[PDB]
Each structure stands twice: as structure tokens, then as C-alpha cells.
Amino acid sequence: DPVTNICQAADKQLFTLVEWAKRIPHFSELPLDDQVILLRAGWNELLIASFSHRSIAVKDGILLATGLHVHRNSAHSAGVGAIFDRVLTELVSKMRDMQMDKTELGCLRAIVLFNPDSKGLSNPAEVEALREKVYASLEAYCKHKYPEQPGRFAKLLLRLPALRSIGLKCLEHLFFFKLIGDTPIDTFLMEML
Amino acid sequence: PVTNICQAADKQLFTLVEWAKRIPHFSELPLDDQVILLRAGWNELLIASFSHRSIAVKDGILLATGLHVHRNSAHSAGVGAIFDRVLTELVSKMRDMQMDKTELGCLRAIVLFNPDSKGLSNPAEVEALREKVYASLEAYCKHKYPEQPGRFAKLLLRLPALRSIGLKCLEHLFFFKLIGDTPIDTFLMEMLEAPHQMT
Amino acid sequence: DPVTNICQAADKQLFTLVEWAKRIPHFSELPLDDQVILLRAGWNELLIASFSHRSIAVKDGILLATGLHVHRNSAHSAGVGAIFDRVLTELVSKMRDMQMDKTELGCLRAIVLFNPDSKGLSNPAEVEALREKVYASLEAYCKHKYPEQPGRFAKLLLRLPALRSIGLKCLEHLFFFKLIGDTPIDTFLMEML
Amino acid sequence: PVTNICQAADKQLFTLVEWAKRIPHFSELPLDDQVILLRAGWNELLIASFSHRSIAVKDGILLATGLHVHRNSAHSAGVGAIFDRVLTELVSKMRDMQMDKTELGCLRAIVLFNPDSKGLSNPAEVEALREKVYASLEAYCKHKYPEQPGRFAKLLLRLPALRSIGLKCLEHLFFFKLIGDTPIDTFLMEMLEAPHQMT
Ligand SMILES: O=C1c2cccc(O)c2C(=O)c2c(O)cccc21
Numbered sequence: 001d002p003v004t005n006i007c008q009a010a011d012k013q014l015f016t017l018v019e020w021a022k023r024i025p026h027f028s029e030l031p032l033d034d035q036v037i038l039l040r041a042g043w044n045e046l047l048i049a050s051f052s053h054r055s056i057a058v059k060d061g062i063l064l065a066t067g068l069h070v071h072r073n074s075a076h077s078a079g080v081g082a083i084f085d086r087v088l089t090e091l092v093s094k095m096r097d098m099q100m101d102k103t104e105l106g107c108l109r110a111i112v113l114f115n116p117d118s119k120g121l122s123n124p125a126e127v128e129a130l131r132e133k134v135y136a137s138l139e140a141y142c143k144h145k146y147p148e149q150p151g152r153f154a155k156l157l158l159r160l161p162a163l164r165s166i167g168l169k170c171l172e173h174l175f176f177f178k179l180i181g182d183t184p185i186d187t188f189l190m191e192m193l
Numbered sequence: 194p195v196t197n198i199c200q201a202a203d204k205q206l207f208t209l210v211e212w213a214k215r216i217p218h219f220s221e222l223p224l225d226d227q228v229i230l231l232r233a234g235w236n237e238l239l240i241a242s243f244s245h246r247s248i249a250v251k252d253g254i255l256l257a258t259g260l261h262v263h264r265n266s267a268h269s270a271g272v273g274a275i276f277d278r279v280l281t282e283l284v285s286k287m288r289d290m291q292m293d294k295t296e297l298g299c300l301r302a303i304v305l306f307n308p309d310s311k312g313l314s315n316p317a318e319v320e321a322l323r324e325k326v327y328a329s330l331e332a333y334c335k336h337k338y339p340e341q342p343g344r345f346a347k348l349l350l351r352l353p354a355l356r357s358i359g360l361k362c363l364e365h366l367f368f369f370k371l372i373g374d375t376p377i378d379t380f381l382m383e384m385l386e387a388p389h390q391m392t
Numbered sequence: 393d394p395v396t397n398i399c400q401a402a403d404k405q406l407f408t409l410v411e412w413a414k415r416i417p418h419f420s421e422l423p424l425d426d427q428v429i430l431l432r433a434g435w436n437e438l439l440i441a442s443f444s445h446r447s448i449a450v451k452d453g454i455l456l457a458t459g460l461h462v463h464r465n466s467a468h469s470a471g472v473g474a475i476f477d478r479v480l481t482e483l484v485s486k487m488r489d490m491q492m493d494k495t496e497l498g499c500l501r502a503i504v505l506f507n508p509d510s511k512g513l514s515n516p517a518e519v520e521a522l523r524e525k526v527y528a529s530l531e532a533y534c535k536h537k538y539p540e541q542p543g544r545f546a547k548l549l550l551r552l553p554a555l556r557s558i559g560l561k562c563l564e565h566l567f568f569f570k571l572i573g574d575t576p577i578d579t580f581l582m583e584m585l
Numbered sequence: 586p587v588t589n590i591c592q593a594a595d596k597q598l599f600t601l602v603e604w605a606k607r608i609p610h611f612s613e614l615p616l617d618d619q620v621i622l623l624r625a626g627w628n629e630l631l632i633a634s635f636s637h638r639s640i641a642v643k644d645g646i647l648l649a650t651g652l653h654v655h656r657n658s659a660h661s662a663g664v665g666a667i668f669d670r671v672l673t674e675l676v677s678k679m680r681d682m683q684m685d686k687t688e689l690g691c692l693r694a695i696v697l698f699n700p701d702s703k704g705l706s707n708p709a710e711v712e713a714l715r716e717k718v719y720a721s722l723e724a725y726c727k728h729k730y731p732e733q734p735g736r737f738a739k740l741l742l743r744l745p746a747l748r749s750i751g752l753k754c755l756e757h758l759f760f761f762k763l764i765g766d767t768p769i770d771t772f773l774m775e776m777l778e779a780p781h782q783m784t
């Protein structure tokens with residue numbers, strides 16, 4: 001039975017995301033009220049950046065880490081279809097063409113996560129500092145693992161605006177609910193024949 | 194499970210698919226169309242039902258269980274304009290005209306058989322069925338309330354209010370009500386000290 | 393020069409719409425504050441219902457009554473393209489298949505215009521009354537001009553929900569500005585070569 | 586004409602296309618791409634510019650002409666969250682770090698050469714050009730402010746704030762400010778008694 005099952009999926013992700021977050025250095029040292037404000041500011045961008053890198057192994061689809069590999073369908077609203085198209089055009093194919101690595105991707109999420117602009121933060125400035133340390137390390141990594149490509153660090157950071165646009169649309173069209181929840185709903189409805 | 198109440202809204206889901214199967218001719222449609230028609234109407238169908246069911250109570254919205262929401266909570270939750278919209282546009286109107294259960298059912302069936310739903314194999318048949326339902330609601334309306342010639346048209350003209358109201362009840366700002374329950378949930382997760390043993 | 397020119401177009405329509413509105417029986421008898429509240433509630437639906445019936449003479453496009461006949465383009469946002477598609481699927485092809493007539497269409501706009509649900513009305517109830525008189529006449533017309541087709545009156549009224557959805561999207565994606573204003577903007581930009 | 590001021594925002598439009606033509610290599614792109622790139626950036630480009638230009642004033646936004654908007658009007662107009670967002674997210678930040686005119690220009694050029702704009706014939710070249718601009722902004726940043734290693738990255742990370750802020754400034758609720766000037770305009774139209782002679 002579908003809806004409760006979908007709630008189970010939401011809970012599982014976002015406990016996982018909070019688990020990832022706990023393992024980032026210095027996130028826990030932050031005031032508790034802060035840690036929440038950051039997770040709420042960033043849950044969508046952090047998820048999309050993940051579902052997108054995973055999906056590198058797939059041609060034309062999104063892959064959920066339950067192993068479900070998801071596609072655009074006929075009866076989707078213009079909006080949902082467009083989010084699919086944007087994930088692939090602006091994120092997955094790029095992460096792919098450049099062969100973005102997991103260290104690099106993790107660093108990007110940590111930068112996304114440590115957002116000094118998130119509203120209500122007790123100390124905005126020491127988020128900015130942690131955001132600076134992370135990206136500084138990411139620069140150094142890029143400059144060492146791939147020194148032939150001097151612009152790679154920037155190219156990574158400049159995927160961040162797109163994450164923002166997509167993150168906003170995904171909030172708008174309920175993209176997560178319909179990713180996790182499309183198959184269980186449609187499949188249940190087919191115990192109506 | 195224990196902590197999983199409320200997501201038990203598939204009881205509401207179950208009840209709806211059960212009602213749809215009952216409508217004449219619904220099940221004869223292609224199985225994919227049926228799914229489309231339901232994914233498409235589930236929203237207005239529930240809203241239309243809860244609005245009607247609230248006529249029986251002199252204020253507020255009787256969602257279910259006797260679960261009764263009054264203007265104070267909604268406005269507290271920051272969802273005031275939508276509460277008022279449902280009440281002014283639909284519930285108030287349903288009450289003043291005394292929309293009966295049979296009229297509500299027809300409008301609802303008309304909502305289900307919507308021929309503009311995206312992805313339909315057989316739109317033609319869906320319109321055809323809609324015609325059948327409205328032809329009948331008019332026949333019912335002319336017999337039962339002969340004194341109001343304009344009653345049938347009046348019913349169909351609530352359907353625009355319902356459409357706009359439904360689109361509203363799907364905005365994400367509306368759902369993510371519970372600001373104080375969202376932090377509480379994430380806070381319990383963060384305060385969990387599970388990974389403090391690791392050898 | 394484009395922008396001022398686009399403003400000129402907006403002004404011209406919506407003075408026209410207000411002119412149409414003045415010619416409807418009993419709109420002017422309404423309190424002035426009311427007449428405004430109705431025009432603001434309905435300017436988009438009233439325009440779309442018009443651009444849509446006009447466009448009956450066109451295959452795959454929208455026709456503006458300046459004679460400009462407009463199409464979907466490559467670089468449109470998913471949203472603008474979808475509005476185009478919805479106008480044709482839900483309005484124009486239907487108005488077309490049934491051969492909706494101008495009397496019938498005018499009656500529909502008058503019903504759209506006299507919206508008792510519009511906020512702030514001094515007397516909501518006498519809008520409802522004028523809305524009732526209009527549709528009552530529309531019923532009679534249909535039942536006389538086309539008595540072979542007994543459901544036509546309803547079929548007309550049941551295009552009204554779609555007008556509502558589309559009207560809302562057109563407000564959301566600035567569809568009017570980009571209808572009147574796409575050609576002048578693109579054409580000006582091409583005095584950059 | 587006389588009553589048509591303000592729509593005279595193509596002066597602002599003129600100025601922008603003039604600046605774009607100046608950027609190295611912009612005009613070498615296919616003429617359709619240029620139009621796409623501008624239709625796509627015009628928004629963030631103007632916002633980025635007005636935010637920077639406001640650093641020079643100790644509060645508010647200096648749009649142009651010395652046209653100065655302070656917190657009171659915006660909040661009166663009901664556009665407070667967006668005003669604060671521009672000020673907190675961009676203008677405040679631009680001031681604290683002392684973003685100079687050269688840095689602002691680079692970010693702006695980076696915005697113009699955006700390779701995700703829909704409908705581009707030659708996306709590859711657009712990325713290629715973006716690389717050229719950023720490579721340089723970094724070279725400029727490392728020479729001029731050698732003591733801040735993290736300065737370049739800090740600049741690019743305002744670009745997400747700008748993107749979200751731009752998307753906001755295109756919402757229709759935002760534009761249709763002037764509630765009291767909209768009725769006034771329609772009222773003059775309605776009160777016009779022109780069609781009171783007709784033979
Ligand atoms: O439309 C609703 C609604 C729908 C489904 C579950 C709900 O809890 C609600 C509301 O609580 C609600 C509300 O509190 C105010 C206006 C509309 C609605």
C-alpha cells in the first residue's frame with residue numbers, strides 16, 4: 001500500500017542526508033538550531049546533486065539508489081518533464097563529460113550545505129568560514145589530481161547556479177515525491193483491474 | 194507501523210478508487226486511461242467532497258473522522274487565503290443552494306471523466322462519458338427542482354472555482370505546513386548518537 | 393524601439409477589452425469600483441478566450457488581431473511552450489471541432505466577466521444575477537440555433553474550467569507580454585549586427 | 586510620446602546590448618545565439634549592476650538617475666522579502682568584500698556567456714568563452730588581491746544568489762505592484778464617455 005510506503009522512503013532519505021551531513025567535518029560543532037536551518041535550506045540541492053551524479057551510468061534517465069532507474073513518461077506535466085531534461089542537460093551530462101569524481105562531488109555538496117545565506121542562522125559568518133575551507137581544499141585537490149586542466153575548480157563551482165534553479169523547480173513541482181512515489185502509486189492503482 | 198498515521202491517507206485513496214470503479218463505464222476504459230484520470234482528478238475529487246461534507250457544520254471544514262478545522266487554526270498555519278477560498282467559493286455556495294448528494298456526485302463524475310488530461314489514449318470516449326453524466330444531472334435537476342431553471346448551469350460553474358482551488362492545494366508552501374514539527378523531526382535525527390561507537 | 397512600443401500594445405488591448413465590457417448590458421450600471429474589480433479578475437481569461445477563437449483559422453499557431461500569427465519557438469521555456477500547447481488542445485481545437493460561434497463566445501466572456509467570486513465586490517449577489525441572465529440566454533440560443541445537439545450549452549460552459557487553468561498559467565509565465573512583445577524585442581536585438 | 590516614460594526602459598536595453606557587443610568575442614557568435622544569450626541574461630545583468638551600484642550608498646538600491654529606493658517604500662509596496670534578499674545576499678556582500686568594477690564586469694560577462702541557455706546552436710563555444718573570462722578574473726584577482734586566496738571562488742559563489750534573486754524578480758506578483766495605479770488607469774478608461782454620441 002502506497003502512500004505510507006512513500007512516506008517510508010522520504011524518511012529513509014533525509015535521515016541518510018542527515019547522516020552524510022553529520023560526517024562532514026564541523027557540521028556538528030555548529031549550534032543545533034543552525035544545523036537544521038542548513039538542512040532545510042539545502043535538502044533539495046543536496047539530493048539532486050546526488051541523484052544526478054549517480055545517474056551518470058544511465059543513458060537518458062534518473063537513478064535512485066534503490067536501483068530504480070526512472071524516465072520521462074507520456075502523461076507528465078510540462079513541468080516534470082522539463083525538470084528531467086534540465087537534470088540531464090545541465091547536471092548529468094556535464095558531470096559526465098568532465099568525469100566529475102566523488103571527492104569533487106562531495107566537496108560541492110559541503111559547499112551547498114554550508115550556505116551562509118540561509119535565513120535565521122545564529123552565526124552566518126562562521127558558515128562562510130567553513131564554506132571557505134571546503135572549497136579551498138577542493139581547489140587544491142583539483143590542482144593536484146588534474147593539473148593539466150587549470151579551470152576545473154571553477155567549472156565545478158559554476159555548476160552551482162544550475163543546481164539552484166533546478167533545486168527551486170523541484171521544490172515547486174514536487175519532484176521528489178513523484179520520483180519516489182510514482183511507481184508505487186501507479187502500481188497500486190493497478191489492483192483496480 | 195506505529196508512528197506512521199496520517200500517511201495512512203491511502204485509506205482515502207482506497208475509497209476513491211473504489212468509488213470510481215462504480216461509475217458506469219469507467220472500468221471499460223483502457224486501464225492506463227483510468228490511472229491517468231484518477232491521478233488527474235484525485236485532488237478536486239477530495240476537495241469537492243470535503244467541502245460538501247462541511248455544509249453540515251456551521252463553520253469550518255469537516256475533513257474526516259469528525260476532524261474539524263476552524264478558521265483560527267488555518268490562519269495560524271498561514272493557510273488562510275486557501276481556507277477562505279474553499280469556504281467562500283465552494284462551501285458557502287454549496288450550502289446556500291442546498292447542493293444535494295446526487296448533484297455533488299455528478300459534478301464529481303464529471304471531474305473524473307476529464308478529457309483534457311494529458312496522456313489519454315482515448316479522449317473521445319472520455320468526453321462521451323462526460324456528456325452522459327451531465328445530460329443526466331440536468332434531467333435530475335429539472336425533475337427535482339423544476340422551479341430553478343438555472344440550477345444546472347449554476348452547478349457547472351462551481352467547477353472553475355474548484356479547479357483554481359485545487360491548483361492551490363498542490364503548492365509546496367501549502368504542504369510544508371508544520372514548521373515546528375519539521376525541525377523537531379530533523380533534530381531528533383541529529384541528536385541521535387548512534388555513530389559514537391565504531392570498532 | 394521595442395519596450396515603449398510593447399507598452400503601446402498593452403494599452404491598446406485592455407482599452408479594447410474595457411470597450412467590449414462597456415458594451416455588455418448592465419456592466420456600466422454596476423458600481424464603478426465593481427467594474428474594475430471584474431476587469432482585473434478577468435483580463436487574462438477574457439483575452440485568451442478571444443485569442444483562441446480568432447486562432448481557429450490557423451493551423452498550429454496563435455493569431456493576435458494585429459494579424460501577427462504566432463508560433464512556438466526553439467528557445468522557449470518549457471512553460472511558454474506548454475501554454476501554447478494547452479491553448480490549442482483545450483481551447484482552439486475544441487472551439488473548432490464544435491464550430492463555436494461568435495454569439496456563443498461572447499456569451500462565454502460575459503459569463504467569465506461577471507464573476508461573483510471576484511474579491512472585494514460591493515454586491516456579489518447582483519453579479520451572480522447578471523451571470524445568470526447571460527447564461528440563460530446562451531442556453532436558449534443554443535437550444536434554438538442548434539436543437540439537434542442538446543448538450544452544446546453544457547459543453548460550452550465546460551470549457552470554462554480549462555480557461556481558468558490556462559488563465560492562471562498565462563499570468564504566471566507572462567504570456568501576454570511575450571506574445572505582443574517577442575517579435576519587437578528579437579527584431580530590435582537584430583540591429584546588433 | 587508624453588505619457589510613456591518608464592516604458593522607456595529600452596534606454597536600459599540599449600545600454601546593455603551596447604556593452605555586450607564590446608565583450609571580446611561576443612559578436613563572433615551566431616546572431617541567434619547572441620539574442621538568446623541576452624534574452625537569458627538581461628535580468629541578472631541588470632540586477633547585478635544595480636546591486637553593485639548601491640554599495641556607494643549606505644542604504645537601499647540606487648537603480649538609476651539617482652533613483653533611490655529605501656526599505657520603507659519597498660516594504661510598503663509589499664516587495665520586502667526581495668528587497669532584503671538583494672541587499673543581504675548581494676549588496677551587503679559586495680560591499681564587505683569591496684567588489685570592484687572589474688570583478689563585477691567579469692561576473693557579468695560570465696553571466697552572459699551562459700551555456701545552458703535553451704536554444705543555442707553552439708553551446709560549446711559559449712562555455713569556451715566563459716572559461717576565458719573566468720581564467721582572467723582569477724588572474725586579475727591573484728595579482729590585485731594576493732592576500733586573499735579565496736577571493737575568486739567567493740565571487741563565483743554570489744552567482745547562485747543572483748540566480749535565485751533573478752527568478753524572483755520575474756514573478757508576476759512582483760511586477761503588478763501599483764495596486765492604486767492600476768485601478769486609476771482602468772477607471773479613466775471606463776469613465777470615458779466617448780461612445781455617447783452615435784449617429
Ligand atoms: O484543502 C485542504 C486540505 C486538503 C487535504 C488535507 C488537509 O489537511 C487540508 C487542509 O487542512 C486544509 C486547510 O487546513 C485549509 C484549507 C484547505 C485545506
Ligand SMILES: O=C1c2cccc(O)c2C(=O)c2c(O)cccc21
Pocket residue numbers: 632648654659664667668669671754
Ligand atoms: O530588482 C528590483 C527592481 C528591478 C528593476 C526595476 C525595479 O524598480 C526594481 C525594484 O524596484 C526593486 C525593488 O523595489 C526592490 C527589490 C528589487 C527590485
